[PDB]
Amino acid sequence: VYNIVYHGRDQRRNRPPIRRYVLTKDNVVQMMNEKKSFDVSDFPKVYLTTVEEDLDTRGGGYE
Amino acid sequence: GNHTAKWMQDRSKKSPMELISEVPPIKVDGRIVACEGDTNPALGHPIEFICLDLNEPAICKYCGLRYVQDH
Amino acid sequence: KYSWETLPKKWVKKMERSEHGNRFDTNTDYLFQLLCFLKLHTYTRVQVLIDICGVDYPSRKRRFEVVYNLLSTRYNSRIRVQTSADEV
Amino acid sequence: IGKVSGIPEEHLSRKVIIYSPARTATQSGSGKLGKWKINFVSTLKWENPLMGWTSTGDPYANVGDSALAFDSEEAAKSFAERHGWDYKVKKPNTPLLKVKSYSDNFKWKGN
Amino acid sequence: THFGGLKDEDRIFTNLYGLHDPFLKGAMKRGDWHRTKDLVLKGTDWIVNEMKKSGLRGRGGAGFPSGLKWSFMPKVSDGRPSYLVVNADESEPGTCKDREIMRHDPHKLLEGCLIAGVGMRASAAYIYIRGEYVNERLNLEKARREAYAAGLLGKNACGSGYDFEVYIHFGAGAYICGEETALLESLEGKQGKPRLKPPFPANAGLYGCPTTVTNVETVAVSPTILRRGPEWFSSFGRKNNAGTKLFCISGHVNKPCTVEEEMSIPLKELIERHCGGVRGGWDNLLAIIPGGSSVPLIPKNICEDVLMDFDALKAVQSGLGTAAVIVMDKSTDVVDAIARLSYFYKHESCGQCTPCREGTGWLWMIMERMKVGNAKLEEIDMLQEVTKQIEGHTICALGDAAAWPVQGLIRHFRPELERRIRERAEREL
Amino acid sequence: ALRRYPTGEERCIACKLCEAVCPAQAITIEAEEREDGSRRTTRYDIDMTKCIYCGFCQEACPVDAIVEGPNFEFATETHEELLYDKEKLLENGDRWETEIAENLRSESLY
Amino acid sequence: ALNYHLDSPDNKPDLPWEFSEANQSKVKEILSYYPSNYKQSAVIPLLDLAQQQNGGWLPVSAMNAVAKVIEVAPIRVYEVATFYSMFNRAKVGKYHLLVCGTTPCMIRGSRDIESALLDHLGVKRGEVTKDGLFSVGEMECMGCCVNAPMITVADYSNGSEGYTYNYFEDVTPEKVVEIVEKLRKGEKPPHGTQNPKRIKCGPEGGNKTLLGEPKPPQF
Amino acid sequence: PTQILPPRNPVGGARVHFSNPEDAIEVFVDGYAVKVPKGFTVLQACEVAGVDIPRFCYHSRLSIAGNCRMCLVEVEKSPKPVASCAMPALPGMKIKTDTPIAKKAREGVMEFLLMNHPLDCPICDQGGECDLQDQSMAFGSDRGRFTEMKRSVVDKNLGPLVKTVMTRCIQCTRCVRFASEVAGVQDLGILGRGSGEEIGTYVEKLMTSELSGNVIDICPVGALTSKPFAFKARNWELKATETIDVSDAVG
């Protein structure tokens, strides 16, 4: 209320600028050679969701 | 009036210009007034501070009300 | 992102973003081939074309930009492959 | 790309003006410059006689200003030449940043 | 060492209290105009060098090292006749040390005009008397007519080959016009609105011609600095700060007086010795504004052992301005006093720049609320932040001079402000 | 309904904020310095048919000049009547002021 | 104090106004100080001279005459006349007692000085008395600070001749009312410290520093 | 790493006029060197760098002023935010226009300007086209702590062209400079000091000068507005055509 400094509170404009840098063939062949192996944890995790029958057990039917 | 003759074709109910030019100017103490609106600062216009240095009444632009110095 | 390492570099031709939803602005020729990838792939399984958003930039040379959204119900991620094709 | 664009014939013989809107003289701020806009003259606007409001007949009334703004005279000219309009590009008049300093207000008028 | 003791033969401003004749036949007896012909003949570079060697700092609020300031003036004259505006105008609250040089030995001020003029290659001196000093500028015009009739000033500087004439301008009641970059304009005829610093007065000041604005006390000790020893002058005060400031013990002292005394003097020693003592004893002291009004307070717990020199008072989170020490005892409403100071800075603010023009009326409104207690405990942090919004941004240091009293009041007597606010709260409900 | 100040004088100073905020561009406002000198709208015509009743005009208006009266019962036999004229039919809010002033006095807390 | 002009029969740009004799010479001298051009520099002294000549206030005709004498557009003279505080633009009577009001006076009873002076005279703050003689006007720091409470009179009775801007300092309510009565009786009270036992700007018990006879120090 | 920096062309395509290609001073605007001729104020050294520094009284045609401090960029080694409008670019000077000190200085000043300023934006003729509104909505703070009695000023009669509401006017002095310099008639003035500052003729004096209707475009605030265009329209309704004029042969 009495501390109206804005640039700290700002959200619209208080963001890092877009860093659009070009990759040339050298960079990507370097990256492909650097990627030696796809060990586990270099793989996207699965969104695990199984179904399970439940009648009214959550809270006892009372929420 | 003539401006008020553009939107009002009734010409029997008093034109708003006259309804505001017939209300007396409000005496006050200082050199600046508030005129927040009718009475409730949230149901009137944005508060408009008027200067009363002149002798003639200084109208509030938003509400037409008039204020005089009352020294 | 895993998807950029495996993907043939040529397929993500022009651009690539890294926030507000990641995108692979590709070329129109490699598009359905790129859409063949990210689907029918074990570690990138989208299977769900959410949306195909035409976007028109008159000041570009390739006016339109056919923004293919893609959801991955398996890995719970969303990729936005784009293109660029003018009026003809 | 004028014929495939579905625009009616009578609106592809239109004469446009590819200007760059000058800065609004009232406000000294350049945040709306450099956005070249085609200007379909679209002068024909009468007054619908029932109510006081106006009433255009040209389809290209507003889109010249609204939502159709390029970023360079080359892109705007390429656009107005694809569609087959007779564009007359009106160059933007830009300001000279003439050198000026504070200490010139307190200049000495010799004697 | 241990400073403070200045013997009556070491006070530069003799006839301060107007006991003896101020004009000629009364000034030559006090050594004024003694051998200025030799000094002018000793040259300009020698004068600047001896002023720098004497370590004389600015007697005015700026505190800049004089002499070094006089070396800023151009050496080769490119057609612009270098001027010398003397800042006689003070208008700082508390400051009468100028009022005792314009009258009561003004010939020191005129001889200083001449010696600094030959010092900084000047060609005319415009003693900008404060507007209200009507009797003072009448005495000074009398002494100027004298020094003109005695061949001291005008077409030959005291018989020497230097053409130097002193003209006496006088403003009209404006503390703002007193500023260095605003003196030049208020004297140029325009309003007393400061100019921005990128054109410095030494480069393009009065009439665009180069000039340096000097307070009367700095320009007026210049003669006796040169005639006596620059080593003798620098033998007073601490290492950097050196000289004999002319103080003005202003308020709430049982014997208020302006008295010349060595710099680096303990503030308590000055109070207890010369002006008597803080009304009701030193234990009755509440706060002290050590400089003029452009300086934060001293809450009496760092006022016992603080020295009235630029460096120490700057190190105590305050400033030594015109050294117009304003003393306030436990009986005053210190928040009301600082509210009246902020009202002063609201009144005497030429309004040229937005941070001061508006924020000073704002500071006055917040102070006239907090002196009753109408504020909220977080406004004391708005007031600090408002002052820090005013401080660095204004054209001249008046923005500072208006943010500093309130900043010091907050920093020191925040307990008292908070107490007034809480007492207002409990008064309600 | 275009509100009025208790002492006559249409509350609608012609800022054109509601004409700007209107999503459907229903409100057409033309302004003229009246002889009294205080700005007012020579033409304040809301086109109710071209209007989405979203209350943006009530929010955007600075002085609460335009408000939506709880009427909602104004089905008109002919379309031309449904176009609410320049400050004459929206000036019928004076009848609805007794309810509009109540709703505003109770909503202004939000 | 308005920062603009409201015409009046006493004060309007129609009225002819020009520096009287015994003041044209002062005008010529004041203009002689400053160079041929840049004579605008002399707007403060010329305006103060016009204020002294017209009995204490600056009519618009006076500012126009100063502008003609000084050769700038009258707006620049108007700008300087409204800026500087000493220039009264409405009549302040014959004396215009200026009582300082800054902190070094406020803490030393200057509010009581002003209140006593006001209730004795009977004017709000700056209104001129029905007698047309006196008027009170607050002024910021007047320099007279160690002389703790002060009151400056601006004798506008004669005009540019008997114009005395006296400093009555170290005053008290009784001293102030005495000064005002002795002023309305015609005579000129002795200015300076209204409190003996102290020399001007002195330590109130006899000065403690400047005692030895002045003499040329060892140069 | 093979980045793509934006072009960073001047602020409005402003042609930069070197008096000679030798005295080009090189200053750093946000760590991006720009070559500006000798004598360019920091504001122009930034308008060469595409950085648009918010200015209230600095007009390129008019003289340079410090009547407000809305620009206050922070140069590298100065103790206080320098007003960009008057600080001449020195070679090697590092201008940081968006550093927290610069942004806090801008917010500070835009609070002072909106402090004694009346809430006339709805009834202000220049409501949409306003430097004060568009600098508050872009560089000034989102909230105002001033809750007291704003100062108010009577409306001066400046003729049948310039409607004047000096309460809105921020006393940036731009018009009193335009009438003294470009219009050259010298009728407007900054009468008084402090917040009591009032812009206009001290005696009722219609601006007899032609070319003095442009003070409205000069004015960064509604205060000075076209009385003929009293309120008839808004900054957004007006469809603009870049036509020419035929009244006088200057074209």
Ligand SMILES: Cc1cc2nc3c(=O)[nH]c(=O)nc-3n(C[C@H](O)[C@H](O)[C@H](O)COP(=O)(O)O)c2cc1C
């Ligand atoms: C806020 C402020 C207050 C000032 N007060 C005074 C003053 O009381 N007396 C004075 O002679 N000059 C005053 N000046 C002007 C200069 O700061 C400085 O005192 C003068 O130009 C040169 O004095 P010096 O040579 O002793 O440093 C003031 C300037 C500012 C910005």
Ligand code: SF4
């Ligand atoms: S507003 Fe303050 S800093 Fe700016 S010129 Fe006036 S007194 Fe100086």
Ligand code: SF4
């Ligand atoms: S509710 Fe109001 S703003 Fe919205 S469309 Fe209807 S008239 Fe326009």
Ligand code: SF4
């Ligand atoms: S109804 Fe509200 S927004 Fe529309 S013109 Fe009137 S005051 Fe402005």
Ligand code: SF4
């Ligand atoms: S100039 Fe007018 S529109 Fe702009 S902020 Fe001030 S009152 Fe509002």
Ligand code: SF4
């Ligand atoms: S009237 Fe307009 S141009 Fe003149 S000072 Fe005020 S805001 Fe600036």
Ligand code: FES
């Ligand atoms: S207190 Fe400052 S002069 Fe009287």
Ligand code: FES
């Ligand atoms: S416009 Fe450059 S600081 Fe005021």
Ligand SMILES: [Zn+2]
């Ligand atoms: Zn109102």
